[PDB]
Symmetry: C3
Subunit: 322 residues, 3 copies
Amino acid sequence: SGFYHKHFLKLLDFTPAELNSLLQLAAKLKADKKSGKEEAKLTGKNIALIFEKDSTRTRCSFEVAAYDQGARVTYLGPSGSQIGHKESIKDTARVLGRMYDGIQYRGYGQEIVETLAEYASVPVWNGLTNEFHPTQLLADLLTMQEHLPGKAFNEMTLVYAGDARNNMGNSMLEAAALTGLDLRLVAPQACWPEAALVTECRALAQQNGGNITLTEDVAKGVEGADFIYTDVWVRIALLREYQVNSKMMQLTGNPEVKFLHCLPAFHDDQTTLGKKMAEEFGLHGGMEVTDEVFESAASIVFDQAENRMHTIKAVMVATLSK
Amino acid sequence: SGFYHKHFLKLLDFTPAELNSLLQLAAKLKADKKSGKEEAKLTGKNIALIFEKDSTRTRCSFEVAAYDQGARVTYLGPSGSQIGHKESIKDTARVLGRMYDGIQYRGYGQEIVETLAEYASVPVWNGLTNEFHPTQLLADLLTMQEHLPGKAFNEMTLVYAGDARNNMGNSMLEAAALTGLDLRLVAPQACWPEAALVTECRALAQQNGGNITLTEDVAKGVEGADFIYTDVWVRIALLREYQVNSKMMQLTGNPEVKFLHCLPAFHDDQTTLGKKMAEEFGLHGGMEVTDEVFESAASIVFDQAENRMHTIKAVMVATLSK
Amino acid sequence: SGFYHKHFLKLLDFTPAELNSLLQLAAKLKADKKSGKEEAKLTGKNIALIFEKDSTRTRCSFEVAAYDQGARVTYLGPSGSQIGHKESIKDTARVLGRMYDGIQYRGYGQEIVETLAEYASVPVWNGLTNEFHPTQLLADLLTMQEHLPGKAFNEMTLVYAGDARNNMGNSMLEAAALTGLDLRLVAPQACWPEAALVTECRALAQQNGGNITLTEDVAKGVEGADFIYTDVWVRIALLREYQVNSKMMQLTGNPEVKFLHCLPAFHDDQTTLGKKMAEEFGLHGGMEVTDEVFESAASIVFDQAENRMHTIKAVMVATLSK
């Protein structure tokens, strides 16, 4: 149903045909920028980017995306008391929608996005809440298409290893449901998404040709991994054995498995904090991904990072333009 | 007189005919954006927005206004030592006028705006100083026109209730003087606007068909209000009895009284801070405005908020273009 | 020879013929914007401005310069943990180059600029590191041409007085080397630039028609100066006797001597920090420059400040377009 003036607050508010449409729009606009004949469809729009908590990355994707299409951005960073402290979400939203054509929100609970959406009558895009992270997985699913041209998501295996009882885990679940992905969350039990969402999402997943299989077992859960996905742990205790290293890549029995990570990643034995941990916890060569896999032929990590922009642009063009 | 390249530092530097002209320009441009045929008249201008002290709102009004007209904005937020600490106002201004086409300043005393104006060679707009707040009252007088179409400001009665020995009180006075409004500051005496300005402003007010009446009685001052206006108190002690609640609205004897507030406002028993005020000093239903009046069919608060943008745009178009 | 897609990390990575070409491009673009027929050559570019440490001035020069040419800017200010703390320079750069067409970096060591340059596949401009400050001296050498039309830099005498064991001193050295300037660093011995760079850049300086002289003698260093240049001291102890005052200007025996200062400057007995210093340390009339020289007909300080913009624009046009 028309993306026009819709919000983008979580993936499951969309059908798989809507998702597929966003993903194809993201791909036309990628090809168009790269080819030099991008049709700027937001040439008068003013977007507001509220970031209650930082993110170098989402800001940059939302600013470059907007700008390529002709829109101007007002970045509102973590500096004012945050929404709910001195002024009502209901009043912040209501004022903002009088001036801006669309609002990105990144912050705290999904309640804040859902209430900003309710009262600012402009589309509200969800840059990450504690509960969900939809724009990320748009970049991801698009990176997956590109590295398996023609295979449908229906016949792709995704392993997300590590802590999943969080908005990354929740988001993998909503992804599988709208996609039909053979999605394996490979994590200690304590690190697995909530019962209800997994119940809901499996049913949808299966119904679309995939299924959500929850394992602690590395080689088994990885068995025929197409992609292996992880993100930062901090924990190092239960999570240690889940490190994506070339052994894990080998245990797929797959000469063409690929690696993804929503960055930042701790793979060096260099960076201030990463190194601290390499020392303390013995994790040398890297923490959740080994540097030799991160800098492997197999990581498509920086195409994944580039795709963050092409999909946020798709969300904004889809909902503000016709 | 034509505003081209004039500074906008306080309302009394303008004649009522100049004020009326700003206000009409604000309303052409409002209608033009709403109708989709805004003529961007600032398409090469670079504006600098110095905010020595925050304001979510003024930044957004200045950014959306500038951008609609084609200008690019450089926001300079409270982060660098403020103007006067490590570098001369005389030097800050002189460098800035070499690069930018106009400077908005929001901060501390009127001395800083008046000095930036003196040395920057570009128009300097006053986003709020301790002494004055002119752009606000532009939004306000425009909101008043719209909600009493045809009635001239001479025949509208404005009540500004609450604390008034401040830039809001000073600004109401300058507004009455250039307008001819029957303006009633319904404030405790400890809170009245500095005597001479009232002496000056009332003689100009009268001269234009209104008169400024300073009182402490709610009933007396509210008598036949057209609009009732307030803003945040903190104090709760002398100000308590001045809360705009439906009894105040009723004491106008006027069923079409409409309410105004330069936001933010403490009307909830939600807003963390406000909630403490509700417990701590007992202002339940809100502090300076009751939530039932703030969310009344009588409040024009968010049109007032939207009008902040249409009038900042008028100031900028008037002074950077012909 | 072409600057196209080249980085800009220090002056000595360029030949005197490349430098001369930047400086002439800077002057065409100055004249063009002043004569209203600037050809915006960056109309689709997205530039990222990383400022690990503040600067009111560099941000403004980079923002106005980029915007006049049609580019959109994403200012990344000191707010995220800085590059190296939670994420690899190698990863920050690699993600940024996927989105932005050029990166300005201002911060810490030259190692950070040189690594960002290495891994971001776009040009990286050096806004100031501890070791070098090239864009500044572009503005400076352009301000010098303009105030001695026709004299070649070979036939100019520059005095840089005060502390030089720093990126301003290092930068004067690289300037002399590529220019042939009779450059005199009139500094205490404690404050002389490091020896190896002086060995290198004197030899290049001479080879181009100038020579680098370092002295503690104000009178012998100043002797026939064309321009006298200084910057902030804090130190007040060894540096005191180096204050540029009208006696120094007189000791050039040169009536046409002109004064330069990369701002901010402590010349008032007004600004809070300058007043502490004025009373505590008895430097009335200013600290490193006297106010009577700063506000002299000899100070070309604000043309120098304006020129900051025309040269950053030259750097960006030179390296992003053809």
